[PDB]
A paper describes a structure:
Inhibition of the protein-protein interaction between NEMO and IKKβ represents an attractive alternative strategy due to the crucial role of NEMO and its selective involvement in the canonical NF-κB pathway. We have previously reported the design and characterization of a coiled-coil stabilized NEMO construct encompassing the IKKβ-binding region fused to two ideal dimeric coiled-coil adaptors, at the N and C-terminus. Here we report the structure of the unliganded N-terminal domain of NEMO, utilizing the coiled-coil stabilized NEMO construct modified by four additional point mutations, designed to improve solution behavior and crystal packing. The crystal structure reveals that NEMO folds in an irregular dimeric coiled coil in the absence of IKKβ, with discontinuities in the heptad repeats causing an underwinding of the supercoil in the ligand binding region.
The mutation I65M was introduced to provide an additional site for selenomethionine labeling, to aid in phase determination (NEMO-I65M). Ile65 was chosen for its expected buried position within the coiled coil, providing a more rigid methionine than that of the natural sequence Met94. The SeMet labeled I65M mutant was prepared to facilitate the phasing of the EEAA structure, but displayed weak anomalous signal, and the structures were instead solved by molecular replacement. The I65M mutation affects the opening of the hot-dog bun increasing the interhelical spacing of the three heptad repeats starting at residues 65, 72 and 79 to the values observed in the IKKβ-bound structure. The longer side chain of Met65 extends deep in the interhelical cleft and the structure accommodates it by increasing the interhelical spacing by 1.4 Å and rotating the second Met65′ away from the center of the bun. This increased spacing seems to trigger the opening of the bun in the following heptads, till the end of the stutter “heptad”. The open region encompasses ligand binding pockets I and II. After residue 82, and approximately at the start of pocket III, the I65M structure closes back to resemble the apo structure, confirming the role of IKKβ in maintaining an open pocket III. The conformation of pocket III is instead almost identical in the I65M mutant and NEMO-EEAA structure, both in interhelical spacing and in side chain conformations, with an RMSD = 0.372 Å over all backbone atoms within residues 89–104. The data suggest that NEMO-I65M unfolds more easily and more completely than the other two constructs, due to the prevention of a compact packing of the dimer at the beginning of the discontinuous region, caused by Met65, and destabilization of the packed regions of the coiled coil.
Numbering used by the authors:
A (entry chain A): 20 to 142
B (entry chain B): 19 to 141
Write the structure that this text describes.
C-alpha cells in the first residue's frame, strides 16, 4: 500500500512525536518532584503548629491550677484579716463602755469624798 | 534505500508501541501531579484556619490575663488596707486596756479613802 518514502516520512513523524512526549514526561516529573517536596514542607510545618498548640495547652493547665492555688491563699488571708478587724472593733467598743462606767463610779466616789470632808470640817 | 517495505513497517509498529507507553506515562504523571496539587491546597486551607484560630485565642488570652492581673491588684490592695487597720486598732486596744487598769487602781484607792473618811465622822 505504502511506498518506502512514505514509510520513512511516517517514521520521521513518529520520532518527532516520541521526542515531544519524552519532554512532557521529564517536565511532569520535575513538577511532581517539586510538589511532593512542597507537600513535605507543609506537613513539617503543620506538625509543628499542632505540637506547639499541644505544648501551650498543657502548660496552661498547670498555670491555671497555680493561679487557683495563689488566689485561694490570698483570699483566705484577706478573710482572716477582715474578721480580725470586726473582732478588734467590737472588743474596742466593749472596752470603751466599761471605761465610761468606771468613770461614773469615780465621779460618784469623788462626790462622796467631798461630802465626807465637809463633814469632818465640823466635828 | 537501505531498508525494505517490511522492515520499515515493523519499525513503524515499534515506534507506535513506544508512543503508547509514553502516553500512558503522561496520563499517569498528570493524575499524580493533580492529586498532589489538591493535597497541598487542603494543607494550606487547614493551615490558614489554624493560624486564624491561634490568632483569636492569643487575643482572648491577652485580655483575660489583664483582668486576672487587675483582680489580683484589687483583692491585694484590700488586704493591705485591712492589715493597716488591724495594726491601728491593736494600738488603740492596748491603750484602752492600760486606761482600764489605771481606772481600777483609782477606784480601789478612792474606796479606801471613803471608808477612812466615814470612820472619822462615824457614818
Amino acid at each position: 500500500s505504502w511506498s518506502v518514502k512514505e514509510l520513512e516520512d511516517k517514521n520521521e513523524e513518529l520520532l518527532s512525536e516520541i521526542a515531544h512526549l519524552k519532554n512532557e514526561v521529564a517536565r511532569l516529573k520535575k513538577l511532581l518532584q517539586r510538589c511532593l517536596a512542597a507537600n513535605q514542607e507543609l506537613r513539617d510545618a503543620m506538625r509543628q503548629s499542632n505540637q506547639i498548640l499541644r505544648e501551650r495547652a498543657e502548660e496552661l493547665l498547670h498555670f491555671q491550677a497555680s493561679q487557683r492555688e495563689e488566689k485561694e491563699f490570698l483570699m483566705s488571708k484577706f478573710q482572716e484579716a477582715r474578721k480580725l478587724v470586726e473582732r478588734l472593733g467590737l472588743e474596742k467598743l466593749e472596752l470603751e463602755d466599761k471605761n465610761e462606767e468606771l468613770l461614773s463610779e469615780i465621779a460618784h466616789l469623788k462626790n462622796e469624798v467631798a461630802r465626807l470632808k465637809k463633814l469632818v470640817g465640823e466635828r
